[PDB]
Amino acid sequence: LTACPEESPLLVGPMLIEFNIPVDLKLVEQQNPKVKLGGRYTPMDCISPHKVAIIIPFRNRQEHLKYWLYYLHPILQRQQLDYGIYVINQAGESMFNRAKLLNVGFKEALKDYDYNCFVFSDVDLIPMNDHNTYRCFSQPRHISVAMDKFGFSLPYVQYFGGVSALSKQQFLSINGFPNNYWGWGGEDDDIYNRLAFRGMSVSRPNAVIGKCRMIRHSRDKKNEPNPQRFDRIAHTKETMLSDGLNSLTYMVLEVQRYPLYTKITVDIGTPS
Amino acid sequence: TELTKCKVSHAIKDIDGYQGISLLEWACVLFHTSGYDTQAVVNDNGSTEYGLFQISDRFWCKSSEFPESENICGISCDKLLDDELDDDIACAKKILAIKGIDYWKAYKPMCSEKLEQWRCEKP
């Protein structure tokens, strides 16, 4: 009935994150009885001003998804967020397009509820401290600041990949993310460039609070490094006007509401 | 092996200043070029780039797939996939002298500003 406190009293701080034991969603659902169809949750204890759509780009990584759900659902409930989990599944065989799938997630999530914050997260990143809140701030937020892959450090100050959070306004302000980055690399840098061109700065928790684990995996022959990525990021200032939310097109092939999440399989076309 | 910035910086000391490129600039280039992975392999446009420096077999090193490239560096491309950086560095110097820094496409867009973060204070 009343607003949730600024900081949740349920936080535990650091957590052990391991990808050795096998996960069972049925057990996951059992442990998280408060999560509703489609992976929706809303605090019944207080009112959260954080209406968060968590968007996960995805293709053929059901096992990573299992761990993601096993670790995040309890964390997100502790953080007292009014959230929804959206897996944006790329149908087909073209190179993976992370940013386009995040754009899709943004539009589809809005059909479900009036979310005011969007967390974009790779399916293989898990936060090691629940103090790293999965929500939005006065400035665009970069959440995966100290990934084990980078030695629990931020690899470069312009890094905005992994997990990030933008309020609806911040996202609308940069015309969303690019749709033309096919294959691996650079799209997160393009997004970084967009935020800077729109007068915004990147906010981040410190290196201790932002520790994260990445489930490593074998190279994806379907996500080869994008040869045009270096040329593309040098032109964001001009291309963010013509490539983004305003030019997004795709076809929804299926919407599945599972107990722990919503999965939208989409046909996003091919490299033009 | 995925080296750390400081490990790479220390390994490439003797390239510092060559053709005007600093170690700060190189640490930055190498991170965005290979992610400091001495075993990185990227194959595209009919050629394959190798190691930390992503040296191409199109002109610089000799590979099985393209056995008659100019092999300007006079080295088998597989010598660019280990943790002994001396020959990688020697080849990169040749590229710097012949083609110049723009062989590395990461340099201009990612390493034209905010260079101080790339320093390794570790002796």
Ligand SMILES: CC(=O)N[C@@H]1[C@@H](O)[C@H](O)[C@@H](CO)O[C@H]1O
């Ligand atoms: C232009 C480019 O390749 N940028 C990549 C970026 O996409 C990636 O998220 C980051 C961490 O792996 O490393 C950068 O070098």
Ligand SMILES: [Ca+2]
């Ligand atoms: Ca070598």
